Design a protein around this nucleic acid. Structure first.
Ligand SMILES: [Mg+2]
Ligand SMILES: [Mg+2]
Ligand SMILES: [Mg+2]
Ligand SMILES: [Mg+2]
Ligand SMILES: [Mg+2]
Ligand SMILES: [Mg+2]
Ligand SMILES: [Mg+2]
Ligand SMILES: [Mg+2]
Ligand SMILES: [Mg+2]
Ligand SMILES: [Mg+2]
Ligand SMILES: [Mg+2]
Ligand SMILES: [Mg+2]
Lengths: 122, 158, 85, 135
RNA sequence: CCUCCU
RNA sequence: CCGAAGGUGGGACAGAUGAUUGGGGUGAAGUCGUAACAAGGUAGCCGUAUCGGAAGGUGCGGCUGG
RNA sequence: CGUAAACGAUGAGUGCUAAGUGUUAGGGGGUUUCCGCCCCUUAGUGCUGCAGCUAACGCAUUAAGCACUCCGCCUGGGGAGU
RNA sequence: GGUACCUAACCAGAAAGCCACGGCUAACUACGUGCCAGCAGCCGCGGUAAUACGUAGGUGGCAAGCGUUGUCCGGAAUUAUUGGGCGUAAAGGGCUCGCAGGCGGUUUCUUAAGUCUGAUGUGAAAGCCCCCGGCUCAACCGGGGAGGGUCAUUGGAAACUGGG
RNA sequence: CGCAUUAGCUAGUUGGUGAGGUAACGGCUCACCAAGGCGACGAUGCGUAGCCGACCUGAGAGGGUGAUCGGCCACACUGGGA
């Protein structure tokens, strides 16, 4: 359940789109990523598997991406739980961390406000 | 542009022939504006002028610019070339160029005045520090990122 | 009465054979100091069950008391869960 | 190593060894035990005075003492200084420096614990050879 | 087959 | 009654020391050969066995880092 | 008995990331009566070669690439696998 | 203890030092030795022209001392959680089967141990430190804070990890 | 805190019931019952050590120290008892 490597690998070879097995949180990550401007639309099909639809992330609609050099790292099975106070910022801004909360995500202000740091990405 | 040149090192190198050892000098020279531009330099295993000539080409070929938010770089970056590994980390005002030897030369002639820099492997490792300064230009200041993303500058930072 | 409560614990009953007595095992996940992984810790305890009601599997609550033996320090306040076989 | 591996078996530091082990052992007459005490010098009695050839690429007659310390450990130690400071079987104080040439000689005899000379009329830092400054 | 030491 | 010290006993453990003995390290210019590095003059090396002043040799199987 | 240069000197599992060409055992589908040719495809086994990686040599969908899980192992040379 | 401090002469008189100067790290020449005598933190100097040895004359730091030896941390991303590796540099177990352990597809519901979060109590004094004041500034003393907890107790949140 | 080149340890030991003792709870002591308790999350053994405020160092993580000064503990020629 690592979309990040799927993205990195396709992003490296400047692929137009990629089909990632869908899960609720992998759906909710792709939309966080889409907040910038990736994904145009997907095709929900008759469900046989729970993810056959995939995420269909299409960050390279044109020849070259305006949003290129996508990079992620902080995804270990050893759980890394952030304090609302001590949520990090990727590159001191210019990068986001998908901090899984009971009710919120994203910036440093969206930590002391929202609360549960939980997961931490880059 | 108005370049200043700095001599990093001059090592006597040698080829062996039937006669014996035949010596040349390989000079390594950093060159830069002191205002965002800086060049690698090689020295063609002969002299310093040969080094300067190649340096002044590499300033405009390689490091097209060194991004500079104030008197420091935009973000923290790890420059790696071979076993070169430089940490280049943005500092506060009045910090100084805290860096070691060859790294200092680059950052001084780049015009960076406030930076923290640790070397994690050492041997005229200017190529590694060059790759980081380019890696800043991947996400310079914030104008590109915002434009690349599809956002404003204050939207991106806060 | 406005009494400050003693430290209360809850866990599975690992021992019972000892009559008027049990061993309650408060399993928990302490973080390792350096490496930060949640390691499966387990503290055994010694509580008192006068009736001899508890058995293997019971996720009982226990509260601190006067020292009821050399090792015993708690009472069976209530059998919350009642596992069988 | 995996995190699980690092938990199961931690990291292990390198054991750094002292360059002067003989000055680290005290002694007790009563218990007849060495004690762990960080000494800067040790008194001893010279059991043998002589000369020894250095290793390559050097040649010399390097004057030394086999010395028996207060802690009961027998060391070899270099008699430093130009001119005959070699001395004979007698009490002496010792120091912690190796003679790179002489293999086994991990200690110097301190010049000034008794009758010494060393290099007389030293240029500067005139305190290394027991050179009493004349007036 | 061997080719003293620095 | 309990009971310190003491006595007796057979074990356990640790250090020191011991005729002699074993390899090890080190040491400007000792003796013997020349095993390895080139196809190193019988390609070398690995495991094992056996033999031989000594490097080593030979068998069997393996490897190419021939 | 329990060791080998027991070697790919490369732990196992999983996913992802250009191509080209042999070959082993299958499968499906072309017009065709088959044979045969052609296309596709699974699992092996080779060679060449992108990106990426590498101190370099080289590796490259049979990764030494990009990731995650778990195990084994390393920490200057000798002394000593004593 | 007729001791600190003041006045007032004799008067700047009484109050300069040690170490270092190949390179690291800003800092050289005569002579005497002749692989000797000696030097050496490391690299290394000396076999009859020694900028690193014996002597003789000559210079940057910190300031009655500074040299030498000993111990600890740093430099050492050199035991690497932060932050390293294992084709050939040291390093893949000869290969399986597997107990424990570690780790585990997707949805939904519920739970709330973990996770997060609010509030309350303590974590002396000194020391170091945030504002820092006072004592002429100091080589020093006071107050109000802060840190200090894998810490209680209690009320939430419930995405994620765990349980049904 | 170190050592698995220390893997089994324990027999008032583990719990009960009763009696006694104690300022006081209690195998704390004893009687009589059972058969427990501890341990790979390292018991047991061996080695080392007063612990803490702090101190030194370091970007920090960490590492080392615990003289002087403050707090808790322990001891008072060696050992036992009131
Ligand atoms: Mg030969
Ligand atoms: Mg041969
Ligand atoms: Mg034979
Ligand atoms: Mg083997
Ligand atoms: Mg084989
Ligand atoms: Mg092997
Ligand atoms: Mg298996
Ligand atoms: Mg370190
Ligand atoms: Mg090798
Ligand atoms: Mg190897
Ligand atoms: Mg293998
Ligand atoms: Mg003690």
């Amino acid at each position: 359940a690592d979309m990040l490597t799927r993205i990195r690998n396709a992003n490296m070879v400047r692929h137009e789109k990629l089909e990632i097995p869908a899960s609720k949180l992998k759906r909710e990550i792709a939309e966080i990523l889409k907040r910038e401007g990736f994904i145009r639309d997907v095709e929900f099909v008759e469900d046989s598997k729970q993810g056959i639809i995939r995420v269909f992330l299409k960050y390279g609609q044109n020849n070259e991406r305006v949003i290129t050099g996508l990079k992620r790292i902080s995804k270990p099975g050893l759980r890394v739980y952030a304090k609302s106070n001590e949520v990090p910022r990727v590159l001191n801004g210019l990068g986001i961390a998908i901090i899984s909360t009971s009710q919120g995500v994203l910036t440093d202000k969206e930590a002391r406000a929202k609360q549960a740091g939980g997961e931490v990405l880059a | 542009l108005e370049l200043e040149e700095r001599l990093v090192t001059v090592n006597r190198v040698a080829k062996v022939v039937k006669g014996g050892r035949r010596f040349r000098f390989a000079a390594l020279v950093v060159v830069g504006d002191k205002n965002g531009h800086v060049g690698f330099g090689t020295g063609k295993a002969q002299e310093v002028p040969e080094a300067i000539r190649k340096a002044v080409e590499d300033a405009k070929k390689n490091l097209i610019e060194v991004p500079m938010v104030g008197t420091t770089i935009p973000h923290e970056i790890i420059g790696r070339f071979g076993a070169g590994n430089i940490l280049l980390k943005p500092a506060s005002e009045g910090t100084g160029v805290i860096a070691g030897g060859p790294v200092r030369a680059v950052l001084e002639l780049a015009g960076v005045a406030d930076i923290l820099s640790k070397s994690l492997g050492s041997n005229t490792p200017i190529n590694m520090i060059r790759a980081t300064l380019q890696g800043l230009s991947e996400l310079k200041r914030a104008e590109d990122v915002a434009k690349l993303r599809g956002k404003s500058v204050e939207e991106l930072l806060g | 009465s406005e009494r400050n409560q003693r430290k209360v614990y809850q866990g599975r009953v690992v021992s019972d054979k000892m009559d008027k007595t049990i061993t309650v095992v408060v399993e928990t996940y302490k973080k390792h100091t350096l490496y930060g992984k949640r390691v499966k810790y387990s503290k055994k305890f010694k509580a008192h069950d006068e009736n001899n009601q508890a058995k293997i599997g019971d996720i009982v609550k226990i509260m601190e008391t006067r020292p009821l033996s050399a090792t015993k320090r708690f009472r069976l306040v209530e059998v919350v869960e009642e596992a069988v076989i | 190593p995996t995190i699980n591996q690092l938990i199961r078996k931690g990291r292990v530091s390198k054991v750094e060894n002292s360059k002067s082990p003989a000055l680290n052992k005290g002694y007790n007459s009563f218990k007849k035990e060495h004690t762990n005490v960080s000494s800067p010098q040790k008194r001893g009695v010279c059991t043998r005075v002589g000369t020894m050839t250095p290793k390559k690429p050097n040649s010399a007659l390097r004057k030394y003492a086999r010395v028996r310390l207060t802690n009961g450990i027998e060391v070899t130690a270099y008699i430093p200084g130009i001119g005959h400071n070699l001395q004979e079987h007698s009490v002496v104080l010792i120091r912690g420096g190796r003679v790179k040439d002489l293999p086994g000689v991990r200690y110097h005899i301190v010049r000034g614990a008794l009758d010494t000379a060393g290099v007389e009329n030293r240029a500067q830092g005139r305190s290394k050879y027991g050179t009493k400054k004349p007036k």
